[PDB]
Structures are given as structure tokens and as C-alpha cells.
Amino acid sequence: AKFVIRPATAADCSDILRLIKELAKYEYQVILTEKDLLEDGFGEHPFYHCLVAEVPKEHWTPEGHSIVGFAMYYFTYDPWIGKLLYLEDFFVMSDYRGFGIGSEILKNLSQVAMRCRCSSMHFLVAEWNEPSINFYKRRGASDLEGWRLFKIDKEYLLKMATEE
Template structure:
């Protein structure tokens, strides 16, 4: 098994995290949508999450982004990151972990399903929507 360390990010990791975000966007064929700029260990993966609250089920961990560089997949790094996130969720008394996966991303879908994930879009019929900033500004200015 490959040697790796799972740890919390520090401000010194910003350039590596931005590099991984850009690599994730490239993998998802959405490079042009990354507008962030940059303000020992070689970082080869990351998970970005936050806590939120669902009035029906309580506190949950929302996994915003999760990525391991292609050449480092298959060594158990992703499984360890997900295990670490699960430990954080349990310790913080979350009732579940939620995340999105692109429909075309079958390897990731299978990765999560093997670990007990449920596909809410097919099981519960939920659809994802977004309101872009221009429309948020427009609505915010309405009287």
C-alpha cells in the first residue's frame, strides 16, 4: 500500500489546493468556470466540506468537492479521505453526508455506492437547481 497522510489543510496549502481544484474542473470538463485565484508533502488529493442543516434529518456534512489525482487513484487514498470525513461527520453528530456527482461520472458513482451511498435523484426524485449571481442581484433589488 502506498504511503500517504490525511490531514487538515493549512493556509500554506492554498496553491496546491487551487491546483487540485483546477485539475478537478478539467476532469469534469468545466475548466473555464474556475475563477478562484491564489491569494516536505506533495498534495495529491483534497476534500472540501462544510456543515449544514436539514430540518427533516438534522445536521449533515456536505461534501462540496472531493478529488484524487488520476495517477494516485487505486492506492486507497480516496477511501481514507472518505473514512476521515465519515469520522468527522460522526464526531460532529451529523445524521448523514450529502454530495453531488455528475451523471456521466460512473467511476465515482460506483465508488460511493460501494460505500453505501444512495442516489437521491433516482430514489427520491430531487433535482438540483441554481440561481446565478445576476438573478440574485435582480431579486435582491426588487421592492
């Protein structure tokens, strides 16, 4: 009912994976491990940053968890405009929604963007996810040729890395 928003620490990684998997579940599997998450976020070069919502013992989940929400983000670069904050995952446990946790994470995300001089914050939302679409729209969000996403998988990267 009351809560604190703070940067994640390494000891939060198990809760982060649990919430990544709960958001995946809401959108739809997840093959990332706690160890990856730990190395990728808290090693020498962080590949993502996380804000976490923490509730007092009074309001811990039935399973005993203090962390009831999170956001995962990273920076991207638009070579026409400049740096962007990219919001990757954003989720509050179903029983703690509607009490301002979300809005507080978004204020903290907003602060990061201004500190870091991002012109905009970018994020994906599913078509069917109507409550989230309206929630974002209320806060200023607009929606954005025809350019296709391509990927080259590690087996082909390996081939090119190791040909001369």
C-alpha cells in the same frame, strides 16, 4: 505510495486551487483566486473545510508537489432532519489513484460527521462518472415533487440590500 491525510492549512491554498482546477478539468471556467480561498477558508469564519493527502518527497509529482489529493466540505442544514456533512469536491491526482488515498479521506470525512453528529453525508456525482458511482455505492451511498434551483445574483441582491 505511502501518504498522510490531514486538515489543510493556509500554506496549502495554492495546492487546493490546483486540485480544484484539476477536478474541474476532469468534470468538463474556475474563477476563484488563491487569495479568496485563503480569506474564505482560514479567516475568522471558514466557509469550507479541506482535508489534503500528502506524500513523502520520494513520491512528489513531476512538477514537485507534495499534495496529491483533497476533499472540500461544509455543513448544511436540513430543517426536517438536522445537520448534514456536504462533500463538495473530492479528487485524487490521476497517477495516485487506486492505492487507498480516496478511502482514507472518506474515513476521515466519516470521522468528522460522527464528531459533528451529522445524520448523513451528501454529495453530487455526474451521470457519466461510472468509476466514482460504483466506488461510492460499494460504501453505502444511496441515490436521492420536482424542485428547481433558482439563484439571485449579486446585482439583484445589491438592489434589494440598498432599497428602503
